[PDB]
Amino acid sequence: KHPSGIVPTLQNIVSTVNLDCKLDLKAIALQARNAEYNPKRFAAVIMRIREPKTTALIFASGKMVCTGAKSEDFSKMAARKYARIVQKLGFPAKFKDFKIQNIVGSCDVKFPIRLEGLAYSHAAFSSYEPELFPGLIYRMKVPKIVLLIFVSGKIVITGAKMRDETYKAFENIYPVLSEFRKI
DNA sequence: GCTATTAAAGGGCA
DNA sequence: TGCCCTTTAATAGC
C-alpha cells in the first residue's frame, strides 16, 4: 500500500468531541486531580492522563480537545476517559461528534536532500528560508498536506484528518525527494 | 529553550 | 475581525 516501502509513523493526534453540557471549570479544577486552570492565561482546564498519554483542553461550553495520542483509536479512547472523569465529577457529559482534527506523522527516507534545488523546482509549493527554519515547507495541494523536509532525509507530515492523506502525501513526495537526493 | 508547521477549542483586544 | 491566547508532536539549526 506504500510503494516506497516506508510507512510514516503517526506521532500526534488532535481530536475534538462535544460533551454536550455546560461545565463549571472552577469546580472541575478544584475537584479534579491532574487539572490546571488559569482563566487569565487560557480559557481551558488543562487535564492529563497516563494511558493513552494525552492532554485534554476542557472548555465551559462542554467542548474538548484531546492532543498527544499515537493513533486515532488511542485519541478516541483518551477522550472517552476524560469524558468519564467529567461525568464522575457530577456533570451530564455525553460524547457527541467525536472527530479527528489533525494527524502528525514523520519518516526517514535515509538519504540527504538538496532543499534549495527542491524548492526551486517546486516554487509554487515550496518555501525554504534556512536562516529562520532549517526545513523546507512543502505545501501540497492534493492532498492538502504540509510536509517539512530536512536535509537529513527526515520528513514531518502534518494537517491530515485521515491517515491515508498522510500516507498519500508521502508517496507523492517520495519521487521528488529521490530526484533531489544529495550525492 | 527558541525558531516554523498543523489543527481544534475560547476569552480578550485592537 | 483577524489573531493571538494553550496544548501536542515530529523535525534541526540557533
UniProtKB/Swiss-Prot annotation:
InterPro entries reported for this sequence? TBP, TBP_CS, TBP_dom_sf, TBP_eukaryotic
What Gene Ontology terms for biological process does this UniProt record contain?
DNA-templated transcription initiation
The entry's keywords: Acetylation, Activator, DNA-binding, Nucleus, Repeat, Transcription, Transcription regulation
Q: Where in the cell is it found?
A: Nucleus
Give the UniProt entry's GO cellular component terms.
nucleus
Single GO molecular function:
DNA binding
Isomerase: present as a keyword of the record? Answer: no
Q: What does this protein do?
A: General transcription factor that functions at the core of the DNA-binding multiprotein factor TFIID. Binding of TFIID to the TATA box is the initial transcriptional step of the pre-initiation complex (PIC), playing a role in the activation of eukaryotic genes transcribed by RNA polymerase II.
Q: How does it assemble?
A: Belongs to the TFIID complex together with the TBP-associated factors (TAFs). Binds DNA as monomer. Interacts with TAF1 (via N-terminus). Interacts with MEE12/CCG1. Associates with PWP2 in the nucleus. Component of a nuclear protein complex containing at least TATA binding proteins (TBPs, e.g. TBP1 and TBP2) and ATX1.
Protein name in UniProt? TATA-box-binding protein 1
Gene that encodes it: TBP1
